[PDB]
Design a protein around this ligand. Structure first.
Ligand SMILES: Cn1ccc2c(-c3ccc(C(=O)N4CCOCC4)o3)ccnc21
Length: 165
């Protein structure tokens, strides 16, 4: 199914790739979105996944929020994967630029354990402002199911690999 991944642990794998491109190729059962509590898919991974759905993901998401209200930081919901995947798991990692508590990162990753296999980004990295190296440590220390991590930036990929303990 997946390919070109480096194995980090028994269950965690990583690759230098565009998560949208990976999703489009693999069409996995579950792709993880790096969402906010409003499911406003404006930038980063969410902006790119949404754009690849021709905005279908935002329309669905808007209906979800109208019905159920916002998520919590550290929480998730399962929505349609649209053209990218069977399902999308929207997970809200803390945004430290908004002062959100980093301890909620472990909670965010715990969501992954409800799914046997996921394609995912590193949570709370990029514009969420946390250190990607930390994020990856929490990932491997929390996730017990099979996770294929897509890291867009090659320099960051190299640093994550070369620094992995
Ligand atoms: C299409 N697309 C957009 C984001 C993204 C990611 C992802 C999340 C965080 C990083 C990351 O590599 N950074 C971005 C630039 O340097 C800072 C952190 O990668 C994973 C896969 N595809 C993606």
């Amino acid at each position: 199914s997946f390919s070109g991944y480096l194995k980090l642990t028994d269950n965690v794998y990583i690759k230098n790739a565009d998560i949208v491109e990976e999703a489009k190729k693999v069409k996995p059962t579950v792709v993880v979105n790096a969402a906010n509590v409003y499911l406003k898919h404006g930038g980063g991974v969410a902006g790119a996944l949404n754009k690849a759905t021709n905005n279908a993901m935002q329309v669905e998401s808007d209906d979800y929020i109208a019905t159920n209200g916002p998520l919590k930081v550290g929480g998730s919901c399962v929505l349609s994967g649209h053209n990218l995947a069977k399902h999308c798991l929207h997970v809200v990692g803390p945004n430290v630029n908004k002062g959100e508590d980093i301890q909620l990162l472990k909670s965010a990753y715990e969501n992954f354990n409800q799914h046997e296999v996921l394609l995912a980004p590193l949570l709370s990295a990029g514009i969420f402002g946390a250190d990607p190296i930390h994020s990856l440590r929490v990932c491997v220390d929390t996730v017990r199911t099979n996770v294929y991590l897509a890291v867009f930036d090659k320099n960051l990929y190299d640093k994550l690999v070369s620094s992995f303990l």
